[PDB]
Design an enzyme around this catalytic site. Structure first.
Site, PDB file in Angstrom:
ATOM      1  N   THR B  72       0.823  -1.209   0.000  1.00  0.00           N
ATOM      2  CA  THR B  72       0.000   0.000   0.000  1.00  0.00           C
ATOM      3  C   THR B  72       0.861   1.264   0.000  1.00  0.00           C
ATOM      4  O   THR B  72       0.599   2.205  -0.748  1.00  0.00           O
ATOM      5  CB  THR B  72      -0.980   0.022   1.185  1.00  0.00           C
ATOM      6  OG1 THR B  72      -1.762  -1.179   1.169  1.00  0.00           O
ATOM      7  CG2 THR B  72      -1.918   1.228   1.086  1.00  0.00           C
ATOM      8  N   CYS B  73       1.901   1.274   0.828  1.00  0.00           N
ATOM      9  CA  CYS B  73       2.806   2.410   0.877  1.00  0.00           C
ATOM     10  C   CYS B  73       3.461   2.644  -0.479  1.00  0.00           C
ATOM     11  O   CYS B  73       3.573   3.779  -0.950  1.00  0.00           O
ATOM     12  CB  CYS B  73       3.895   2.179   1.941  1.00  0.00           C
ATOM     13  SG  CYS B  73       3.269   1.744   3.607  1.00  0.00           S
ATOM     14  N   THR B  74       3.897   1.560  -1.108  1.00  0.00           N
ATOM     15  CA  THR B  74       4.720   1.665  -2.306  1.00  0.00           C
ATOM     16  C   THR B  74       3.909   1.934  -3.566  1.00  0.00           C
ATOM     17  O   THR B  74       4.336   2.698  -4.426  1.00  0.00           O
ATOM     18  CB  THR B  74       5.542   0.380  -2.515  1.00  0.00           C
ATOM     19  OG1 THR B  74       6.351   0.161  -1.358  1.00  0.00           O
ATOM     20  CG2 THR B  74       6.435   0.484  -3.751  1.00  0.00           C
ATOM     21  N   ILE B  78       2.724   6.632  -1.547  1.00  0.00           N
ATOM     22  CA  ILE B  78       3.843   7.529  -1.844  1.00  0.00           C
ATOM     23  C   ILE B  78       4.016   7.998  -3.315  1.00  0.00           C
ATOM     24  O   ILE B  78       4.408   9.138  -3.537  1.00  0.00           O
ATOM     25  CB  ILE B  78       5.172   6.995  -1.231  1.00  0.00           C
ATOM     26  CG1 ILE B  78       4.982   6.730   0.271  1.00  0.00           C
ATOM     27  CG2 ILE B  78       6.312   7.984  -1.452  1.00  0.00           C
ATOM     28  CD1 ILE B  78       4.481   7.955   1.060  1.00  0.00           C
TER      29      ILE B  78
END
Lengths: 187, 187
Positions: B72-74, B78
């Site tokens: 999710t972050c990647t 971001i």
């Protein structure tokens, strides 16, 4: 004398010849596979009990590193283990090679992939959250304000018994007792 | 009713309209540059006081993420910040965008590079060791056994005052109040 100004010698840990102290400690890793690389098992971390890993595998190499993607770990320490992996498994009867850091398991998997790991059958990049297991054996590295990374170290476990264990005195720069070459010399 | 079975709503934090609570907290990051990429400044982490960052920069966006390299972050969180960076700096008068995780600064830099960050002049991937700063503002994520990652959140700081601050209720899957789109709507 033997040890001059501010120098230190890396010694064998007292852990040697004793049972692997798994306790109830657990690690996480994410599998990697060249077949079915998009499976859930290759996306999400799974938990492994250290006791189970050791009881199910007759010969295990474990090596700790302070920081995924850091220079010494990435360039000088871990590539040797990956390079010798086939020889370790096929010639030295090693069942598992475990690379331990305190980094999150997604970062560890991405690191392993960047290092050319194609399959985690015999090599796994383990997360030791909060340095719990590594602190328990005294192989930790204090980095300030109550935060601990792994030190740089290597261990061999045969039939549940620690046969080799040693950490660097200068983990940031030295790869000696933790090197795959020193491990090979103690198999 | 408004909120059915086991659902939660992400709300604005009470931090809004108050001074940024920098205290004595510090972060580490490693610079990235397309000129002189082999300089020491682009290899080794440097320490930045949160108070200094805020006092020296009139408009700062800060966004927290649970884990460098996690899905999710990647993929969803971001990249939006990187995509809009030029617009933020050139059109919205943003001086700094800070991406905060508890991951080691080498892993953070490698993550940033993997995400296409070429220069850290206006965007920095900050390490908050042991989640100290993030816990101090209540934006942490408990992951078990006393270990904390950052939650997923975003903040805007203008002239030292928090003008926007909100965290996800489901950081593992949701990118809403922490999204670059929601930040853009609050500039």
């Amino acid at each position: 004398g033997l040890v001059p100004r501010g120098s230190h010698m890396a010694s064998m840990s007292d852990l040697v010849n004793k049972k692997f102290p798994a306790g109830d400690y657990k690690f996480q890793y994410i599998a990697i596979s060249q077949s079915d690389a998009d499976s859930e098992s290759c996306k999400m971390p799974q938990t492994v009990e250290w006791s189970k890993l050791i009881s199910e595998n007759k010969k295990v190499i474990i090596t700790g590193a302070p920081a995924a993607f850091s220079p010494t770990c990435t360039v000088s320490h871990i590539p040797g283990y990956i390079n010798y992996l086939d020889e370790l498994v096929k010639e030295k009867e090693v069942d598992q090679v475990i690379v331990v850091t305190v980094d999150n398991p997604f970062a560890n998997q991405a690191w392993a992939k960047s290092l050319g790991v194609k399959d985690t059958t015999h090599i796994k990049f383990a997360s030791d959250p909060g340095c719990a297991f590594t602190k328990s054996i005294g192989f930790e590295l204090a980095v300030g304000d109550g935060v601990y990374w792994s030190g740089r170290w290597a261990m061999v476990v045969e039939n549940g018994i620690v046969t080799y264990a040693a950490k660097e005195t200068n983990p940031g720069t030295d790869v000696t007792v933790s090197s795959v070459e020193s491990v090979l010399a103690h198999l």
